[PDB]
Amino acid sequence: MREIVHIQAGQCGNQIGAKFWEVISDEHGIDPTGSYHGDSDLQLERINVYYNEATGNKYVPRAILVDLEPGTMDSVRSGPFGQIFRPDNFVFGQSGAGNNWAKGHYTEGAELVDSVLDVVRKESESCDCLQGFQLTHSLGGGTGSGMGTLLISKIREEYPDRIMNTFSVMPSPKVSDTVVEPYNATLSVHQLVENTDETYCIDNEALYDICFRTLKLTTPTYGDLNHLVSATMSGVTTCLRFPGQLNADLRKLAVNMVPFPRLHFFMPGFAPLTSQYRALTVPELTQQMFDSKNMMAACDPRHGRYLTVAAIFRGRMSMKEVDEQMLNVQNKNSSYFVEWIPNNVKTAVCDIPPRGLKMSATFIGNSTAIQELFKRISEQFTAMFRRKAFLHWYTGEGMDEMEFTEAESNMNDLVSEYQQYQDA
Amino acid sequence: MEVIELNKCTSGQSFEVILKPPSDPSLEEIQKKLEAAEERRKYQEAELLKHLAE
Amino acid sequence: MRECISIHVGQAGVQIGNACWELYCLEHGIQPDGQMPSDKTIGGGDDSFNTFFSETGAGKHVPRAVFVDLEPTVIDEVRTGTYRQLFHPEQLITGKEDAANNYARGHYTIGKEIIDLVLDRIRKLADQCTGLQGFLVFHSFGGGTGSGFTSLLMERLSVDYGKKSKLEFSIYPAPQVSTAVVEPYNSILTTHTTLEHSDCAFMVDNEAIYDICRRNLDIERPTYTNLNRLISQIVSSITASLRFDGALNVDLTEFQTNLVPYPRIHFPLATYAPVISAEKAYHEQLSVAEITNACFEPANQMVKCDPRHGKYMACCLLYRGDVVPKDVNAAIATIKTKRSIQFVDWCPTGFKVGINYQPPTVVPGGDLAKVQRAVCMLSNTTAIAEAWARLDHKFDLMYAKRAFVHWYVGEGMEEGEFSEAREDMAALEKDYEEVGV
Amino acid sequence: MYTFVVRDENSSVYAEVSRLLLATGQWKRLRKDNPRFNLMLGERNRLPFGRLGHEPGLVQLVNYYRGADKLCRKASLVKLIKTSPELSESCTWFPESYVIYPDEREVFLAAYNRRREGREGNVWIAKSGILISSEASELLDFIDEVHVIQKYLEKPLLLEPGHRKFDIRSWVLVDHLYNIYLYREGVLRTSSEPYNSADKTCHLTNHCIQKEYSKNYGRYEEGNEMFFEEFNQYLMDALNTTLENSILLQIKHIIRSCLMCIEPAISTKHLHYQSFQLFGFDFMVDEELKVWLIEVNGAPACAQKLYAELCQGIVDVAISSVFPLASIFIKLHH
Ligand SMILES: Nc1nc2c(ncn2[C@@H]2O[C@H](COP(=O)(O)OP(=O)(O)OP(=O)(O)O)[C@@H](O)[C@H]2O)c(=O)[nH]1
Ligand SMILES: Nc1ncnc2c1ncn2[C@@H]1O[C@H](COP(=O)(O)OP(=O)(O)CP(=O)(O)O)[C@@H](O)[C@H]1O
Ligand SMILES: Nc1nc2c(ncn2[C@@H]2O[C@H](COP(=O)(O)OP(=O)(O)O)[C@@H](O)[C@H]2O)c(=O)[nH]1
Ligand SMILES: [Ca+2]
Ligand SMILES: [Ca+2]
Ligand SMILES: [Ca+2]
Ligand SMILES: [Ca+2]
Ligand SMILES: [Mg+2]
Ligand SMILES: [Mg+2]
Ligand SMILES: [Mg+2]
Ligand SMILES: [Mg+2]
């Protein structure tokens, strides 16, 4: 039993985390009350990766819900699958974090972090073989960004030999709540550079463009954005939740995907994205899966080179034809894969498709083109920081300008590090 | 050619055909390697916990 | 009679060992519950099959085997499989978390915590031997356990059993079925550490088995079950001389005498024919000449390479089925005048032939058809160094950028072991070219 | 869209082949160290044949035959013709040669002394720096200062006007099926100096030696290169015969004989990768219209006028035959 402990922090972290548990509970045949009602033993074979088995053969998600205000977590408990979560795993404060990284990381979140770790410890103690942790959160707010990274740091201290994995939603002025999001994101990225093994960069810019340009949604809501995240999160965890050889656990995934410790920020992709009854062939899955319009990070893969790639095909299809199409894309565009990491593209197939689709494909890329994301955040950061604009929200919580300068330098170094392997 | 060393039995036979003539570290040292690597792991983890303590 | 102990390490070693011991039972008439009606000496004996099987008072024939894996899921299959009654729980050793395709994790971090347990379980089987002659070690090159833990086990076996021979069956990494990018690293690391400790290693390239299954068996996308049934046929023909009456390769020392004149050059090329699909209703049974000629086709080798552009140091022909010595010599004479077979000048140009009259056994419901006669050629040719050249080139590409190296350094391994291992392979390639050019 | 790599920049032949493939719009050139190629235009020295044919989902082809150096080296060709029973030492179209290390010295002297005592032509030639001398001691002393010493053809067919020596270069292409294609166009690299059987300029017909030491370079034909149309017309006007009957039958026989000998050693019929190769055969014609084989070149250059036609023929029967898109050769059957 290789268990994973899931944590969702803040508004965005809990809203996408709730939909993630709804999507995978449906795939594993778990109802909103925890009872199993599936028809395939493949659903239960790896069920303990994300679910604890309770009394009466009930399946309880190994999830911990964290926030500094009760609003979003009250909505989750009122949601469809709200009753499935363990009540003690709801850990919340009352003051909120005011979209302020300092409040989440240093003041308001510091008061609440120890009680969160008490629940993490309770969940970890019963694990027969703990793989590590999975955090969902945004980087533009205060709780998920500031307290989420504080949690990552304190968990690494208590569990230094466990994998740290995050789903990190990147801010965008297209889907912006406050102007200080580049501040919060820049401070958080340096934490992720040091203290996570795998981070899926989910860009609200890309989610918006997909909803607008592709899905033809003229006025996208957060629900529209979170539907793309749900399907993506389901795909990237397929190899963890079903029997298989490739990337079956968090560490083996990291060994296949992370050639250098700081370069562990992945571009996720997904196919199909349909605005629906038409049959999608294996060649169509492969072409769309690698297409930039299907990337969730708002980076042009043709502007960089792929260090490593993980591909997951779901449904009843010809694995022979999957091998052919996967080899076709590599041999067709071998200039976009680094030549100094041979056979850096790995393919997995799962017989169980997601809900509503006969066939799907999920893309996990470690591309140097992700520097475009960090450059974008860096430019938005600097435009305000050169005038020290809005800094008083942060210095009022004890922070100094030097910590911002160091955060600026830390992310510029990350950009330089990606650029060195793009031309090597 | 030449067929030499013909040995036969109930379950088979074997022979040789010639076509042309011709023209460790100790356990102590192993334990030192295993413990030296464990020492480097402890040093690397102690530096991490030191970094996290700061 | 001298016993042989088989050791299966990692997923690949366990699953291949499970396929081999199934085949051994069918060949020797041993039922899944361990009973063997053809064995008249109840609860003991020094027959040829007793080199691989011990006997209990109740007549059960127990494999002299140990299964080791750092994750329990694969060996749990043996604990509940068809032949679960053959083994007792002491022969099946499992851990909690595997080596994560990381040689250093299998050798240093996790292997250190289980190496003393494995040796204790091997000592239990060795104490039941009146004259142990050595070990057969099954493992992959690419896995973290198969590479990292094996090299640690082979170091300790040389310490505890200095006079005993050790033979390997090794799975060379192939991207068509590989599951890790760093498998070239683990392969070089485990070959460097095991080289001085292995007397004879039979390398099997998953690429070659995969294509034989696709081309000769008409399997579209071969699985490990397809590959392992074919591998077990080759392993069975290699070890049949230890398990049956005969005069060729009768003990493990004879494998080195007949195939390995130079110690570091201890990687013989295996070629097997015929591989026939059981889906064909009628098939023309191949003659002695046709299957012997097939031993010089690269399409039938366990490692794709060109023996015409290397030199031979030894050649053994192992026949099973309807084969008489007269037809073997007629086939060899025809082949010598058509094929490019160059021996090294300090070795005789000849073949050691072994014939076992019992034709090959096929697993009921398998992919291989029954044949009247089959042959496995074991040839020590310098052309197998093409496999080292391919592996070392992939090593050089990744290591020039130190890609993934931090995973190994983080487990306590030093970066210098990478280059030291690569220099040993560089010396290995140089040895082959001196002999074969 | 096929892919190919280029690993020999000093190849004027495949520089044009690479240019032709890109001009078709269906071939993309990769970096020289990119393993995901269909076609390798490989280097001359230490081509990594062992790394070919191990790319799943890629049919790989290389422009060299592994093992063909046995035919394209001086000492290798001499040893191959003597030791191979298919050719035998009684081979009639190859000059009596011997391999000498600075070994067949005792055999070369047994034939040299037999000629001086025999009162017959005893002029030889050593090569690997070339020395032509009727004194064996001057030849053996020159090597010590691996070589082969073969009988110098003292009676060569001389072209008139000029009374001059020549040699015939034939280009032969062997594809992955081991079809032997003889390019219909050859060249006569002619000496522009009158043959004096009593200077290494009228004796050596190399294009660089005639362009650096011969005073009459280009006097009779352009670049001291006579093509087959002119040479056939000369044979009809001067000797009442054709190029096909008097010479080309022997040339086709020698080409077929040499390549059939090494076929079992170098064929890629059942191999995980495929090979083709362009060879350059060099012949000599004596005064009695007998053809002698001098050397086989493994990486030959072409004549300027024939680069366009020959390189297009390489793409047709050797490259596009394996990788089809969307006769100038004579097939020597066997
Ligand atoms: N022929 C064959 N090859 C296998 C089999 N299982 C795994 N492999 C190959 O072995 C290599 C990976 O090694 P594994 O044996 O799976 O790994 P391991 O020894 O269990 O070590 P860990 O990393 O700790 O899991 C890959 O190249 C696989 O293709 C098998 O059953 N048959
Ligand atoms: N046995 C022989 N008898 C008479 N003339 C000979 C001869 N061997 C060589 N020659 C003359 O000397 C020249 C040099 O021969 P050789 O084949 O060694 O040239 P080469 O290898 O240096 C250049 P290439 O690779 O284009 O042939 C030949 O072109 C020929 O004219
Ligand atoms: N994709 C997505 N992004 C969100 C959602 N809610 C908030 N965000 C983004 O997250 C940032 C605000 O962070 P938020 O989670 O609300 O702050 P927190 O509660 O203090 O952690 C902004 O960049 C928003 O665009 C959501 O439901 N989906
Ligand atoms: Ca307070
Ligand atoms: Ca507390
Ligand atoms: Ca008995
Ligand atoms: Ca030893
Ligand atoms: Mg908010
Ligand atoms: Mg394993
Ligand atoms: Mg020994
Ligand atoms: Mg030359």
Q: Which CATH number fits domain D2-68: 3.40.50.300, 3.40.50.720, 3.40.50.11480, 1.10.3720.10?
A: 3.40.50.11480
The full set of domains in chain A, from first to last, is: 3-265 (3.40.50.1440), 266-372 (3.30.1330.20), 373-423 (1.10.287.600)
Is C68 in the same domain as C184?
A: yes
Antiparallel, parallel or unpaired: β D2-6 and A345-350:
unpaired
Tell me C175's DSSP state: T
**Does D297 sit in the ligand 2 pocket, CB within 6 Å?**
yes
The CATH number given to whatever domain includes residue C25 is 3.40.50.1440
Please choose from D150, D159, D206, D281 the residue to mutate so as to test ligand 2's pocket, defined by most ligand atoms within 8 A of CB.
D206
Report the b/e string of C396-422 with b at 16+ CB within 10 A: ebbbebebbbebbbbbbbeeebbeebb
Closest ligand by atom to A68 CA:
3
Q: Which helix (H) or strand (E) holds C172?
A: strand C165-172
**Does D294 sit in the ligand 2 pocket, CB within 6 Å?**
yes
**Residue bearing tokens 């990274």:** A149
Region class of C370: left (phi > 0), else alpha (psi between -120 and 50), else beta = beta
Distance A339 CA to ligand 9 centre (A): 28
Please name which of C16, C174, C186 lies closest in space to residue C99, comparing C-alpha atoms.
C186
Distance A223 CA to ligand 7 centre (A): 67
Nearest chain A CA: its distance from C96 CA (Å): 7
Query: Six-digit token pair at A195?
Result: 């203290």
Among the candidates C208, C224, C259, a domain finishes at C259
Is C195 in the same domain as C285?
A: no
3-state secondary structure of C303: coil
Is C325 in the same domain as C214?
A: no
**Amino acid identity at B16:** E
Q: Which phi and psi (to 5°) does residue A32 adopt?
A: -60, -10
Q: How many CA atoms lie within 13 A of D189 on its CB side?
A: 23
Q: Do residues D227 and D189 touch, judged by C-beta distance below 8 A?
A: no
Q: Do residues A280 and A272 touch, judged by C-beta distance below 8 A?
A: yes
Q: Which phi and psi (to 5°) does residue B5 adopt?
A: 55, 50
**Interatomic CA distance for residues A178 and A13, integer angstroms:** 17
Q: Which residue of A has its CA nearest to C173?
A: A343
DSSP letter for each residue of C103-121: HHIIIIITGGGTHHHHHHH
Among the candidates C350, C372, C387, a domain finishes at C387
Report B:32-51 residues touching A (Cβ under 8 A). 45, 48-49
DSSP letter for each residue of C154-165: HHHHHHH-TTSE
**Amino acid identity at D238:** A
Is C188 in the same domain as C276?
A: no
> Considering the domain boundaries, does residue C226 fall inside one?
yes
In chain C, the number of structural domains is: 2
User: Which of C168, C207, C220, C254 is an active site residue?
Assistant: C254
Please name which of C24, C34, C430 lies closest in space to residue C262, comparing C-alpha atoms.
C430
Q: Which residues contact C282 (CB under 8 A, 6 or more apart)?
A: none
DSSP letter for each residue of D294-330: EEEESS----GGGHHHHHHHHIIIIITTTS-----EE
Please name which of C362, C346, C351, C357 lies closest in space to residue C240, comparing C-alpha atoms.
C357
The CATH number given to whatever domain includes residue C327 is 3.30.1330.20
Q: How many CA atoms lie within 13 A of A212 on its CB side?
A: 13
Q: How far is CA D196 from CA A406, D191, D204, D206, D230, in A?
A: 87, 11, 12, 17, 24
> Considering the domain boundaries, does residue C425 fall inside one?
no
Chains with ≥3 Cβ pairs under 8 A against C?
A, B, D
**Interatomic CA distance for residues C196 and A252, integer angstroms:** 30
Query: Six-digit token pair at D176?
Result: 């992955």
Identify the burial level of A110 via C-beta atoms within 10 angstroms of its C-beta, where 0-12 means exposed, 13-18 middle and 19 or more buried: middle
**Interatomic CA distance for residues C273 and C289, integer angstroms:** 11
Antiparallel, parallel or unpaired: β D187-194 and D225-227:
antiparallel
Q: Which helix (H) or strand (E) holds B5?
A: strand B3-8
All residues with CB under 5 Å from ion ligand 5: A 114
**Does C179 sit in the ligand 1 pocket, CB within 6 Å?**
yes
**Interatomic CA distance for residues A312 and A362, integer angstroms:** 5
Q: Do residues A399 and A412 touch, judged by C-beta distance below 8 A?
A: no
DSSP letter for each residue of D248-269: IHHHHHHHHHHHHHHHHHH--T
Alpha-carbon Rg for chain A, nearest whole angstrom, is 20
For residue C175, give its domain range.
3-259
Length of chain A: 424
A251 contacts in chain C (CB < 8 Å): 97, 100
**Interatomic CA distance for residues A300 and A324, integer angstroms:** 25
Mapping DSSP onto H, E and C, the string for chain A reads CEEEEEEEEHHHHHHHHHHHHHHHHHHCCECCCCCECCCCHHHCCCHHHCEEECHHHCEEECEEEEECCCHHHHHHHCCCCHHHCCHHHEEECCCCCCCCHHHHHCCHHHHHHHHHHHHHHHHHHCCCEEEEEEEEEECCCCHHHHHHHHHHHHHHHHCCCCEEEEEEEECECCECCCCCHHHHHHHHHHHHHHHCCEEEEEEHHHHHHHHHHHCCCCCCCHHHHHHHHHHHHHHHCHHHHCCCCCCCCHHHHHHHHCCCCCCCEEEEEEECCCCCCCCCCHHHHHHHHCCHHHECCCCCHHHCCEEEEEEEEEECCCHHHHHHHHHHHHHHCHHHECCCCCCCEEEEEECCCCCCCCEEEEEEEEEHHHHHHHHHHHHHHHHHHCCCCCCHHHHCCCCCHHHHHHHHHHHHHHHHHHHHHHCC
Q: Which residues contact C38 (CB under 8 A, 6 or more apart)?
A: C28, C29
**Interatomic CA distance for residues A217 and A224, integer angstroms:** 8
**Residue bearing tokens 């402890």:** B42
Expt. technique: X-ray
> Considering the domain boundaries, does residue C407 fall inside one?
no
User: Given strand D131-133, what is the order of strands in its sheet?
Assistant: D97-100, D147-151, D124-127, D131-133
Q: Do residues A274 and A337 touch, judged by C-beta distance below 8 A?
A: no
Chains with ≥3 Cβ pairs under 8 A against B?
A, C
Tell me D2's DSSP state: E
Is C50 in the same domain as C192?
A: yes
Is C112 in the same domain as C228?
A: yes
DSSP letter for each residue of C339-365: S---B-TTS-EEEEEEEESSPPP--TT
Alpha-carbon Rg for chain B, nearest whole angstrom, is 30
**Amino acid identity at D97:** S
**Interatomic CA distance for residues D184 and C374, integer angstroms:** 49
Antiparallel, parallel or unpaired: β C53-55 and C61-63:
antiparallel
3-state secondary structure of C293: helix
**Amino acid identity at D142:** F
Is C355 in the same domain as C222?
A: no
> Considering the domain boundaries, does residue C429 fall inside one?
no
Q: Do residues C101 and C180 touch, judged by C-beta distance below 8 A?
A: yes
Is C143 in the same domain as C52?
A: yes
Tell me C268's DSSP state: P
Q: Which residue of A has its CA nearest to D30?
A: A335
Architecture of the domain made up of D69-70+157-332: 2-Layer Sandwich (3.30)
Q: Which residues contact C420 (CB under 8 A, 6 or more apart)?
A: C192
Judge if the upstream peptide bond of residue A220 is cis by omega within 30 degrees of 0.
no
Q: Which residues contact A4 (CB under 8 A, 6 or more apart)?
A: A49, A50, A62, A130, A131, A132, A133, A134, A165, A240, A250
Dihedral over Cα of D121, D127, D131, D136: its sign: negative
Residue A75 sits at the vertex; the CA angle it makes with A147 and A24, to the nearest 5 degrees, is 80
Among the candidates C259, C283, C309, a domain finishes at C259
Please name which of A217, A218, A349, A231 lies closest in space to residue A296, comparing C-alpha atoms.
A231
Please name which of C255, C271, C272 lies closest in space to residue C263, comparing C-alpha atoms.
C255
3-state secondary structure of C176: coil
Closest C-alpha to ligand 2, atom 14: D204
> Considering the domain boundaries, does residue C174 fall inside one?
yes
> Considering the domain boundaries, does residue C394 fall inside one?
no
Antiparallel, parallel or unpaired: β A63-67 and A345-350:
unpaired
Contact C306 D49 (CB under 8 A): yes
Which ligand 1 atom sits nearest the alpha carbon of residue C106? Answer: 24
Nearest chain D CA: its distance from C127 CA (Å): 46
Tell me C203's DSSP state: E
Q: Do residues A377 and A407 touch, judged by C-beta distance below 8 A?
A: no
Could you tell me which residues of chain C have a Cβ less than 8 Å from any Cβ in chain D?
175-176, 207, 297-299, 304-306, 308-309, 338-340, 385-386, 389-390, 393
* Resolution for the entry shown, Å: 2.2
C182 contacts in chain A (CB < 8 Å): 255-256
Q: Which residues contact A138 (CB under 8 A, 6 or more apart)?
A: A10, A11, A12, A13, A144, A145, A168, A169, A170, A171
Is C249 in the same domain as C358?
A: no
Please name which of C226, C248, C227 lies closest in space to residue C238, comparing C-alpha atoms.
C248
Q: How far is CA D77 from CA C382, C393, D150, in A?
A: 24, 33, 12
Is C8 in the same domain as C146?
A: yes
3-state secondary structure of C310: coil
Is C162 in the same domain as C276?
A: no
> Considering the domain boundaries, does residue C395 fall inside one?
no
Dihedral over Cα of A79, A81, A84, A85: its sign: negative
**Amino acid identity at D51:** R
Is C255 in the same domain as C280?
A: no
Antiparallel, parallel or unpaired: β D2-6 and D27-29:
parallel
Chain centroid, CA A195 distance in Å: 15
Domain ranges of chain D: 2-68, 69-70+157-332
**Amino acid identity at C186:** N
**Does D72 sit in the ligand 2 pocket, CB within 6 Å?**
no
Which of A2, A45, A46, A252 best probes binding to C when mutated, by most C CB atoms within 10 angstroms?
Answer: A252
